[PDB]
């Protein structure tokens, strides 16, 4: 939940940018639950560290609707899409298609 390490993470809030996991909790309904998906995403997989594979995703109530939400961690390697970041984003839209949940994409990535 640290992201790209206190290091960059702070250099983030510096830009006046709310952090990923924050934008989420702000977006959800007061006190709603949140079911995260693959947090241990890309754990000890890539050479370096890529927390939750640079993208957090999960299901939470937004305006009384169970919604699928995904936002990238600009702090993690510039938010860029490592192979597993893609597998994640995708696995999220499967859960969304298969279970008919509207989608909220909190976009903030390099390339």
């Amino acid at each position: 939940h640290e992201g790209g390490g206190s290091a960059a993470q702070a250099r983030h809030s510096a830009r006046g940018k709310l952090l990923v996991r924050e934008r989420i909790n702000r977006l959800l309904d007061p006190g709603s639950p949140f079911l995260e998906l693959s947090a241990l995403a890309a754990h000890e997989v890539y050479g370096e560290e890529v927390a939750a594979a640079g993208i957090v995703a999960g299901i939470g109530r937004v305006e009384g609707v169970e919604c699928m939400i995904v936002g990238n961690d600009a702090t993690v390697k510039g938010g860029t899409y490592y192979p597993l970041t893609v597998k994640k984003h995708l696995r999220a839209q499967a859960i969304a298609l298969e279970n008919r949940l509207p989608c909220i994409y909190l976009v903030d990535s390099g390339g």
Binding site: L27, V62, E63, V65, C67, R100, P102, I104
Partner: protein, 111 residues
């Protein structure tokens, strides 16, 4: 963003005959001790079933046949569910038992 999800005229599509949600009969944390520590150590799965379903009520199908696979109906937080939990090996009997069960739930639209 919240506001968009606001005017989605959204309505849920699933539909089960869920009932009033009643809690288990044994603290869910008791599971920690249900699972043996020795990976190759035999234990009764019903004990984990008892801690997840409502009122720890579980109706068992082909009770005493291919016991290697336990199958049954119950509810979970209201929603009705058909369960299939392993209990050992898995000889022919267990599979037929499990295929016949899936038939029954697939016919009543129970998860």
């Amino acid at each position: 963003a919240r506001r968009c999800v606001a005017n989605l005229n959204w309505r849920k599509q699933g539909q089960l005959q869920c009932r009033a949600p009643r809690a288990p009969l044994y603290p869910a944390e008791e599971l920690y001790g249900v699972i043996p520590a020795d990976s190759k150590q035999p234990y009764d799965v019903r004990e984990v079933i008892a801690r997840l379903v409502d009122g720890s009520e579980f109706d068992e199908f082909k009770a005493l046949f291919g016991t290697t696979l336990v199958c049954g109906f119950a509810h979970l937080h209201g929603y009705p569910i058909a369960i299939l939990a392993n209990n050992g090996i898995l000889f022919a009997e267990a599979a037929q038992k499990g295929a016949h069960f899936i038939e029954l739930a697939c016919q009543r639209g129970i998860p």
